[PDB]
Amino acid sequence: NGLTDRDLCELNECPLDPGGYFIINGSEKVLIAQEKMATNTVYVFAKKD
Amino acid sequence: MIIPVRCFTCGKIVGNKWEAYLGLLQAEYTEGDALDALGLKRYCCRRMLLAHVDLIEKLLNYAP
Amino acid sequence: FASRHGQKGTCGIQYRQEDMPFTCEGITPDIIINPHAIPSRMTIGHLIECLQGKVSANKGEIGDATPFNDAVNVQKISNLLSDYGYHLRGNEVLYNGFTGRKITSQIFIGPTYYQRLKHMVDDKIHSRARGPIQILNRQPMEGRSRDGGLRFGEMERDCQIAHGAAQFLRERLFEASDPYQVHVCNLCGIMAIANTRTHTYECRGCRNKTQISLVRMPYACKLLFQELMSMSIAPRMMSV
Amino acid sequence: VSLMRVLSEKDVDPVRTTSNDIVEIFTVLGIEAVRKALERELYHVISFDGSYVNYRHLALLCDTMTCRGHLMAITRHGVNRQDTGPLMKCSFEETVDVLMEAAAHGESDPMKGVSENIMLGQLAPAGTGCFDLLLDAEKCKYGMEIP
Amino acid sequence: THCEIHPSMILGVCASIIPFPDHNQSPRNTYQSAMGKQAMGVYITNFHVRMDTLAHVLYYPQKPLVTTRSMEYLRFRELPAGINSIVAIASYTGYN
Amino acid sequence: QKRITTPYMTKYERARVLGTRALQIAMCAPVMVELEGETDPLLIAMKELKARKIPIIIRRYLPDGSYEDWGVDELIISD
Amino acid sequence: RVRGNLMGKRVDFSARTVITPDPNLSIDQVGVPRSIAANMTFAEIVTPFNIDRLQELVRRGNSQYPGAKYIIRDNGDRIDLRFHPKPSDLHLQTGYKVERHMCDGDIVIFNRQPTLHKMSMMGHRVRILPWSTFRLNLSVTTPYNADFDGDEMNLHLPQSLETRAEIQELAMVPRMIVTPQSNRPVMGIVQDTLTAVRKFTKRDVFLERGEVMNLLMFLSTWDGKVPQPAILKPRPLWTGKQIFSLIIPGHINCIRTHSTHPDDEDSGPYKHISPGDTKVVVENGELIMGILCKKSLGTSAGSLVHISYLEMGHDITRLFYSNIQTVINNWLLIEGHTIGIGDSIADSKTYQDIQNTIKKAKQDVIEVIEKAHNNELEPTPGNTLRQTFENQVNRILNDARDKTGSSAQKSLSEYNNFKSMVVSGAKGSKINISQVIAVVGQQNVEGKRIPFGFKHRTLPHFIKDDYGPESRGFVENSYLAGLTPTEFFFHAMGGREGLIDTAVKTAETGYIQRRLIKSMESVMVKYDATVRNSINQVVQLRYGE
Amino acid sequence: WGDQQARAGVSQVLNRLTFASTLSHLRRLNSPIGRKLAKPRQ
Amino acid sequence: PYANQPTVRITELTDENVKFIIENTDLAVANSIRRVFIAEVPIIAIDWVQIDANSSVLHDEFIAHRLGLIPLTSDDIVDKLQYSRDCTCEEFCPECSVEFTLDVRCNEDQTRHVTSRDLISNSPRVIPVTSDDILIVKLRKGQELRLRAYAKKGFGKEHAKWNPTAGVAFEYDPDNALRHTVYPKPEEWPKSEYSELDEDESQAPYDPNGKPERFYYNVESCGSLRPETIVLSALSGLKKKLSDLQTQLSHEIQSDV
Amino acid sequence: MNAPPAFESFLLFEGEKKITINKDTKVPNACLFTINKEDHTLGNIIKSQLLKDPQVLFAGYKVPHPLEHKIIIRVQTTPDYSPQEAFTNAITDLISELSLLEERFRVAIKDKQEG
Amino acid sequence: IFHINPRLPSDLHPIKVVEGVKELSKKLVIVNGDDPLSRQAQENATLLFNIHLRSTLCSRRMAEEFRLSGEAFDWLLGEIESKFNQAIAHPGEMVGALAAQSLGEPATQMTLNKNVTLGVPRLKELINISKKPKTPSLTV
Amino acid sequence: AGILFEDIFDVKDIDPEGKKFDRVSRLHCESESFKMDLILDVNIQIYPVDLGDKFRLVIASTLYEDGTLDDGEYNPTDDRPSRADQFEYVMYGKVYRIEGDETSTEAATRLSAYVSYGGLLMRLQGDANNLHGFEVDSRVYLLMKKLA
RNA sequence: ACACCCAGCC
Ligand SMILES: [Zn+2]
Ligand SMILES: [Zn+2]
Ligand SMILES: [Zn+2]
Prior knowledge:
The structure is cut from a larger assembly and holds twelve protein chains of seven kinds. By secondary structure, chain B is an all-alpha fold. Chain B has four helices and no strands. In chain B, 45% of the residues lie in helices and 0% in strands. Chain B starts with 17 loop residues before the first helix and ends in a 5-residue tail after the last helix. Chain I is of the alpha+beta class. Chain I has two domains: 1-42 and 161-257, Gyrase A, domain 2 (2-Layer Sandwich), CATH 3.30.1360; 43-160, RNA Polymerase Alpha Subunit, Chain A, domain 2. Chain I contains four helices and ten strands; from the N terminus they run E-E-H-E-H-H-E-E-E-E-E-E-E-H. A four-stranded antiparallel sheet of chain I has the order 1-2-10-9, with helices on one face. Chain I has a four-stranded antiparallel sheet with strand order 3-8-4-6, covered by helices on one side. A two-stranded antiparallel ribbon of chain I has the order 5-7. Chain I is flat. Chain J is of the alpha+beta class. Chain J has a four-stranded antiparallel sheet, covered by helices on one side. In chain J, helix 1 (40-52) packs across helix 2. Chain J starts with 18 loop residues before the first strand and ends with a helix. Chain B binds chain C through residues 8-11, 30-36, 42-44, 46-47, 50-51, and chain C through 17, 25-30, 53-54, 56-62, 111. The structure holds zinc ion (3 copies). Residues 7, 9-10, 12, 42, 44-45 of chain B line the site of one zinc ion (ZN). Chain G binds one RNA strand through residues 112-114, 116, 145-147, 149-152, 502, 506. Chain L: It is found in: Nucleus. Chain L: Pfam families: RNA_pol_Rpb8.
């Protein structure tokens, strides 16, 4: 979190690594944002079928 | 990662000019004049030495 | 190899420096792309990048190419280029490498950022001649990483039908993939029990021991008929 | 489309009045009429962008869909309802249903088609396989024989 | 009531490396945006410590000679993914 | 017998006949024509077809139930 | 099982790799890497009159190339040659089979996916070449629908002599020059060769003696006699048409028209002496006037390739293809072709004309908007007032785009390379030149203009209720001038629509095609010349009537 | 995404071919529309 | 006997490049001389690297590649050194190769620059040309690079490492008297540095009965050879190739009769 | 994988010959000199030198494939002059040219260095 | 081929042209036979080509426009016969698959969308029944 | 001596429709002896011409002044004194079409001879009495020299 | 195997 660039290098981690991913069984797993319809809002659609 | 020994296009030696180029830049020389003072006339060598990134400097931060 | 404007391309041939064209200054191109990639696709930004790269390399300054900059247009880049002793539109007189004759049409040449893609041929080339065969079908495996065979699909099958090359179609779909032999009873049409070592052929169900026919077929067809029998469907193999 | 009403109206040409619809032509005019109309409509689709396809291919398609008196769709509901062998139909689509129907009714596949022979690995009757070759003993006897 | 900080910030990470994107046919820009993800440079500085199942490292990456002001924040200057090439658009021997 | 099929020999018939004769030649069959040093079975079969000397009878199956025997020699070669 | 492992199944003796160009091969040849050739094998039957060659191949073994991988005895045992050092079993007898590495001249079916039409699986002759890619002549790229941007292609090697014979006699590339789909040559001259042969056959192309005998080296069907020069004094000079006359085979006769042929020239006094050299006349096998382009050398009915195929068979047309490609490429070494920024810039007068046209068009659109805003726009019959207004705006903007394009192309010099590729037909179109030079034009989504995605606005930057050209997606800038952000976004919308259509229509069209195939996979012409299906029901009493 | 009728592909192996590729993958959005329906693709 | 009578005038001659002019010569001969400059002048370059220890951030093949591209002085020894293929030794020997040794270990705090000056060679006549120096690799404390290399003799047709030139600027007919290149707008093109026209004129008048006769050269040496020696070796090598071809042709003619 | 060794562009291994002669039957007095392991360097000069010889009617060269290392030089001469003699004379003239150029270059270098 | 001079008078008897065309028409056989049914089918199968042949090899056109000689006319008749007999559909040719491929290959290039449906959607509309159309119309 | 046509022409106009090609120009010329009319495409880089220049056309079927058929092969190593010595612009081509003014009954009275010289075309209109040596598919030479 | 992603070419 608070490590500076030198501390990151000494710890064998790239300073330029953005992070934002988990490490599960050694695999860098990233969660992709999932789109969904907005909740709590009234929506009137055009079912013609 | 490191400066190429030779210009890819013509084959002029530019591996010995990276440190001199950095020193000239630290001497408040503009990039064009720094390249001219190093004898790089053809724009291929100027491309080679102007567009290079010294990634080995960052690679050397990690302990062996 | 791909540029920064969706201009793909595989390396077609590799010429040495003496074979490639060259300017009056001795500069030879590192890459030569066909003009015909430009007009249909209208990657004019590629050409502007080449011009701006020439101006940048000569001037010694990483030139700006932000999308919607109103201060940078083609005319200003051309005027800057003309000050360095080059043609304002970026063309140059190239000399034919093989003969040394001047090329009649002046070539558009300059620095452009190319990038090599992971799709390298050595990770794609693939061949097979009687490799390992999978369990269920006794057909070639799937994938280069198991010496698998290429799939001769439905549309290839129809294309060879249209050719009329029935023998090639048979060789592809029966002989080159999974030949097999079965023994079928003649009275009924069910696969029979053949002991080839003791030379005893019988069809339990008919009490038949002398009327048995040997039929060549793909192993996949045998599998289909065996699954059908397990599904209580009886494909009788009437050979007469 | 109300073709038969519009055709019967006063002061309306009953000769050149056509419809882009295909079912109305079949049910009003005839089977040959819908064949011709289908030909014209397919040609209109293909040659709208300037592309050209030889006439005989359109003729073959139109004849195939109108060979059996009624309009035969290029779908399961039109191809699998022909009198073809069960194996060709099961290779097309609805595979298990066709095989069940054949098993129940005891249909026999006469191996006359192409897919039937491909599945069984026999020489398909298609081009090079639509005939047989025989040895000519008399012609082999005569002439030169180096080895 | 509002003013854009700069219009060029409508593009994504992989479309911001394109120089002069507004002089391109938009399908070309889309394909390039799908292409830079396949270009190989130095994917991370500590590549000699990681053991990934696949990894590609270019010997001599170069920052583009024709830059975009947006890549000063994508760190494309420190981890480039290509080389500036003396490209000549010509029909030489028919092999292109 | 008043054969009704075309007297011309089809492309498919040419392909199959050349293939079969090449296979026969490769299996040490007697070549029916002199050869000036050709060793490829396909070339020998092609030469043996240029002359009307292939010993094969094409049996063309009419649709209904019947067949017709045409000597390769008594067909017009289309090349 | 049926569709996945019976109708189509994985096969042995198949290779796959990337394709790259090679203009030095014939149309019927395919370059094959050394490894691919050394991997797959072809089984030759040992005979008394080829036993020495096969014995040498066996002796060379699998290590060296060309060599053998297996010896199959008459009984059936298979001996592997990389596992047996003793020479006892390497003796060959008649009836033995030797599986040799495929070498030059072996026939191979060469396929690309999707396998759309019949010409997408043609036979080629293998030629062994150093590197690791399949190589194709540029002419065969059109039937395969293949480019060299990473396309991979399959190579099937027929195993027995019968299958090899029929691939040779039915489906080699020279035998498939003319498709039956539309009775036109499916292949043709393309890209560099087409642009350079448009340049070459221009009236003002004169070749010195040295260049002429350099070009004649690449002419395979050359009888060896150098033709009399068109100009004898004050210097021997051959014209381009004079060399192309040597390329043209036999004595074919053909008449065609160049793309730039004026319509009124036929009725004019100079009908048979074209001022523009636009009437292609090949008489007695010699090109005596005109400029060749896609309309006389491409995939068009009645082109020179079609006449060559229908006059001199298939082999001579193959040589014609290869000769055109090699000769024109080696002349292009001298002439050279290019495209640059200078080819996308018009005169200042042209830019002023385009700007004035766009200003007038915008003024007209504002006038129509004002007329409709006061309910002074009478709707056209058969359309609503909104539809009438949209039609008027679209017609005005289309007229503006057409006028700007015409003004752009009026100013292109003969040396412009955009026009060089457009008139030759090699690549590009007049619309592309107009878009690059003058105006990209209107951007359409689902046929209409840019919709009001926001609350009655195309983008937040416009005011509500703005039907003008800029708001609804009329890109008034050219590609050279650069698009402003709003019209950049609208252009992105149009391009996305194109991509969606390309990526969606495949999944409909492939299913339509497959259904059409399986509807009539068995219909064929039987031996009484009738067309019947598998049930012997006559579909047509004669094929095509 | 659920117990061991659930979303799939919510978590993916981070793309480490190029730094631009990593950044692009870390900023991706997915629409659960099936893979038909040209309107959401526009 | 229809051989030409070429003449040479040398304009500039420094330690880096030679700028000369050839008159009364075919275009083909001048072009072939240029191609021989680029690709058929032998020099000595590192071609066999064996690495004992390499703890640097650069893998072994990278170090070998950067070693191969270092130019080595090849003034007079390249003539007396035989190709490794033609030599009778088993693998390598002093008569057909030159031995180099590099042994660097960084134990100081600051970074160590393994440059070309660390390439110690047994033969005193073959050294890296920079003896600022060519950078081979940068080393952090605790990292060592210890390797031994052998330099063969070769020319540019094999690999670009054996290229002695650093851009051969070749020009002929600086003003289009021959119209070998057609300018669509001649006024826009800069004049060549060898041009002989005033400001008003853009290109020379067309010469219908002219051929390429004067060729301007600028052979810039990377450092392996002096530029004059590059040109002399090029001419000698082309002469030797032609003489070998003549010998083979004579043998073939005598065998065919 | 299939990358050829770099030295095959200029080296003859056991089996090939540097030059071969093949009479051309299409026209009288013509030869097809096939030279292995060469390129345009020795093709262009030979063609240009042959073009000067007034008794040489045709003189061209081609490289059948840029990946194959082989050139084919076709020479057709007057009836009273053999093509092989034309080839030998062309090579001799080229050698004389290059010797003279080398000598003059050495003299010019000496003059420039001296002053 | 025969170096026919289009200026000098020709030696081709128009009766020879008539006889030659009539004789050639009997060699271009698509439906061989003798009975009236086969004869009518043969006449119909080559009606258009026979009309074109009689129009092009007309007596006046050959005498005035083309001006071929007797040898040239005989060669022309031989060539027409040879080229026609080479154009007859070979038995065993799978024309069904060929036609399906020929109609399905353009489908890959056509785009989607008074309004009249066209392109791939209309092809779906046509090859199916489609008991409910998309855009019915009547060209009255 | 094989001289099919012989006259002196005045260059009345050059490229009336514009500069169609850079190196080739179309001369519209009119004679005065036989009063003919010659459109002719000539190379300009190797042989310039100006408006109002007199030049002699000696269009002939053979340069060897013996009637021996040349057969149309380049023979630069020929010593016999051909006709291409007294003219400074020699061209070779094929007469590819001959038009006229024929009716159904009357004979030709005004003939046009079209000759293609490897691409450079020429039309020669005049009285039929002069254009008799011209024949379709006949190979001819065109000889030009300017007159001071 | 199986499943799921990603990606290539149309
Ligand atoms: Zn350089
Ligand atoms: Zn039984
Ligand atoms: Zn040694």
